[PDB]
Amino acid sequence: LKRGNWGNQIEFVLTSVGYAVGLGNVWRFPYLCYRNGGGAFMFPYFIMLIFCGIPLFFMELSFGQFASQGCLGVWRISPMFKGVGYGMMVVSTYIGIYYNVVICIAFYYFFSSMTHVLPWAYCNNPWNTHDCAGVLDARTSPSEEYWRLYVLKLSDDIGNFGEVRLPLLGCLGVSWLVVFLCLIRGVKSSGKVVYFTATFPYVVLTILFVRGVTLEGAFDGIMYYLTPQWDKILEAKVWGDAASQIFYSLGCAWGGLITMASYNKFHNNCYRDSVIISITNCATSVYAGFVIFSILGFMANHLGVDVSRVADHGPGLAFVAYPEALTLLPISPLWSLLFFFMLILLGLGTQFCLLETLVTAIVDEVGNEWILQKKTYVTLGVAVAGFLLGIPLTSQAGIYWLLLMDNYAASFSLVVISCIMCVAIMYIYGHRNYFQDIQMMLGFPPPLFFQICWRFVSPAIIFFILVFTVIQYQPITYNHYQYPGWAVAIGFLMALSSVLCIPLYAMFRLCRTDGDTLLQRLKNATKPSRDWGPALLEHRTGRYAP
């Protein structure tokens, strides 16, 4: 009755843009483009986005908006399959715990960059070794030694915690305080903040791109980026890497979209917004690639090498590679400040949803007016429980546990959840009723291109992603470190804490549904319950209730 709505469509579009666009469009996409084809990777990138990225986004947005419920209350089409919803909250917990620990290396670097001389420029600090060979000395760069010997003192084993790094506990406190203070009212509070932490990164990117373009030696760094190698598109690996990147980057099956769309009005165009956001998210990765590769080309020119020795994948690029290249520009503590501010803003627009997704559930599932008057207390209850649970990741052996949670927990549990949820709404509920349900909202039948892509093509692409992820599984390794057996076992058990919630809840539900034959018990608890439909009595007309 008092759930509330957004108020402006611009708020919803900006919030979704800031939630989908995260840190995966800055360090992941450029390296993939450089490695897998060059300028010929965009053909598999933009062909597997039309047939796999837009249909899934549209289906999730239309599913969330119809029944004005979060990621846990929309499963009234088949109450037995509610284990999928509980699978969307476990994974969103993991991505809500280790994401704030990445915010130290953006906050700590930002706070340590307010100096007239960058601390990682010259190799004369007492924490250095004999291999300080760099470029700015008046092979080991003096940004890697700072990264692994002063910011975090890396140990020699995953189970070798030595002490908690207090400067990192400081960021975690500050960051959780900011996250809680920015969600003090929810929709009426975050909706007015996304006007800032969704657009400033574009200004920062434009400034950095201009500086890179006018910089000498940059045109040789953009040629390697987008020169076509058409041979690569003839392989199956390139078509298997352009399907996983689209699926993961769009933010599919973490919840969020189903809980953002739950606040929209009933008669809202879910087709225009499903295309605008999808195109905007995929049009930022190219710009980020340009920005990164211009300065990388300048760096390679300065050290007089081909651009193959100065390319890094993840945290080794944003903290070991890019900062080591910004130190050659005239006014470095300003470009570094802007870059780390952009990283902080990019990583902070996603954490808002990962806290509001878990609050909306716990609020609506219980069901009361007492749980609505004290939503801020609930929001504080989850923030202080994500700070105590993220302390072990700030110790000496923090990087080891950081990479084991992003490669096992939220790696293939997401693909399984989406595949099952596709089957649940298409062939169990019925693909002939969902089309009429969507037509009731949009006002026109879905385009024919979307009916053939929702029943045959997209599930096939999901199956292809699932199969390709199994044939190309290798044990996780960090640099030359080899993870022991117990770490792999812990990671596998972590990955089994989300996809194992579907069979258990199904058994629990069918162990209490009154029936005679198991086929009849399966027949029940799989039909829409008598609460499926619009939440307002003014919209219920025709097929759904008198």
Does 172 engage in binding with ligand W5O (CB under 6 A)? no
- What are residue 164's DSSP bridge partners? 395
Kindly indicate which of the ranges 163-171, 289-297, 399-407, 447-455 contains the residues binding ligand W5O, using the contact rule CB under 6 A: 399-407
Contact 23, 343 (CB under 8 A): yes
Does 100 engage in binding with Na ion (CB under 5 A)? no
Does 344 engage in binding with ligand W5O (CB under 6 A)? no
Cα(130)–Cα(124) distance, integer angstroms: 10
Q: How far is the CB of 350 from Na ion (least distance, A)?
A: 4
263 binds, among Cl ion, Na ion, ligand W5O, none (CB under 5 to 8 A by kind): none
Does 395 engage in binding with Cl ion (CB under 5 A)? no
Does 249 engage in binding with ligand W5O (CB under 6 A)? yes
Cβ closest to ligand W5O, residue 377 vs residue 473: 473
**Among 56, 104, 242, 410, contact with ligand W5O (rule: CB under 6 A):** 410
Give phi and psi for 539, each to the nearest 5. Answer: -85, -25
Cα(385)–Cα(86) distance, integer angstroms: 19
Cα(140)–Cα(151) distance, integer angstroms: 16
- Could you identify the residue written with the tokens 């050290």? 303
Cβ closest to Cl ion, residue 25 vs residue 259: 25
DSSP 118: -
3-class secondary structure, 481: strand
Contact 111, 337 (CB under 8 A): no
Instruction: Write out the H or E segment, with its range, that includes residue 477.
Output: strand 477-478
Cβ closest to Cl ion, residue 280 vs residue 497: 280
242 binds, among ligand W5O, Na ion, Cl ion, none (CB under 5 to 8 A by kind): none
**Among 6, 13, 24, 255, contact with ligand W5O (rule: CB under 6 A):** 24
**Among 45, 66, 224, 248, contact with ligand W5O (rule: CB under 6 A):** 248
Site residues for Cl ion, window 17-36 (CB under 5 A)?
A: 25, 29
Q: How far is the CB of 16 from Na ion (least distance, A)?
A: 11
Cβ closest to Na ion, residue 77 vs residue 346: 346
Site residues for ligand W5O, window 290-319 (CB under 6 A)?
A: 314-315
Q: How far is the CB of 242 from Cl ion (least distance, A)?
A: 10
Site string for Cl ion, 163-182 (x = CB under 5 A): --------------------
Site residues for Na ion, window 314-353 (CB under 5 A)?
A: 346, 349-350
Q: How far is the CB of 366 from ligand W5O (least distance, A)?
A: 29
Site residues for Na ion, window 7-46 (CB under 5 A)?
A: 22, 24
96 binds, among ligand W5O, Na ion, Cl ion, none (CB under 5 to 8 A by kind): none
Instruction: Write out the H or E segment, with its range, that includes residue 18.
Output: helix 9-20
Rg of the chain over all Cα atoms, to the nearest angstrom: 24
Pairing of strands 477-478, 481-482: antiparallel
333 binds, among Na ion, Cl ion, ligand W5O, none (CB under 5 to 8 A by kind): none
Nearest to 44 by CA among 223, 226, 246: 246
How far, in whole angstroms, is CA 319 from its chain's centroid?
A: 20
Give phi and psi for 377, each to the nearest 5. Answer: -65, -40
Kindly indicate which of the ranges 241-249, 264-272, 354-362, 449-457 contains the residues binding Na ion, using the contact rule CB under 5 A: 241-249
Cβ closest to ligand W5O, residue 40 vs residue 415: 415
Cβ closest to Cl ion, residue 93 vs residue 411: 411
Does 249 engage in binding with Na ion (CB under 5 A)? yes
Query: In sequence order, which ranges of 315-408 are alpha helices (DSSP H)?
Result: 315-318, 322-326, 332-366, 370-373, 375-387, 399-404
DSSP 539: T
Cα(437)–Cα(447) distance, integer angstroms: 14
285 binds, among Na ion, ligand W5O, Cl ion, none (CB under 5 to 8 A by kind): Cl ion
Cβ closest to Cl ion, residue 249 vs residue 278: 249
**Among 52, 56, 102, 204, contact with ligand W5O (rule: CB under 6 A):** 102
3-class secondary structure, 333: helix
**Among 6, 11, 28, 533, contact with ligand W5O (rule: CB under 6 A):** 28
- Cα–Cα distances in Å, from 250 out to 22, 245, 469, 492, 512? 9, 8, 18, 25, 38
Cβ closest to ligand W5O, residue 141 vs residue 249: 249
Kindly indicate which of the ranges 6-14, 54-62, 358-366, 398-406 contains the residues binding ligand W5O, using the contact rule CB under 6 A: 398-406
Site string for ligand W5O, 69-98 (x = CB under 6 A): --------------------------x---
Contact 416, 465 (CB under 8 A): no
**Among 396, 406, 426, 544, contact with ligand W5O (rule: CB under 6 A):** 406
Phi-psi region at 123: left, alpha or beta (left = phi > 0; alpha = psi -120 to 50): beta
CA angle 116, 119, 125 (to 5 degrees): 130
**Among 190, 285, 332, 395, contact with Cl ion (rule: CB under 5 A):** 285
Cα(463)–Cα(416) distance, integer angstroms: 9
Show the tokens assigned to 390.
């993220």
Show the tokens assigned to 508.
């629990």
Question: How many residues of this chain bind ligand W5O (CB under 6 A)?
Answer: 14
Torsion angle (degrees, nearest 10) of CA 182, 188, 193, 199: 140
349 binds, among Cl ion, Na ion, ligand W5O, none (CB under 5 to 8 A by kind): Na ion
Give phi and psi for 131, each to the nearest 5. Answer: -95, 80
Residues near Na ion (CB under 5 A): 22, 24, 249, 346, 349-350
**Using CB under 6 A as the criterion, which residues of the chain lie in contact with ligand W5O when the complex forms?**
23-24, 28, 95, 102, 245, 248-249, 314-315, 402-403, 406, 410
Residues at the site binding Cl ion, with contacts judged by CB under 5 A: 25, 29, 249, 285
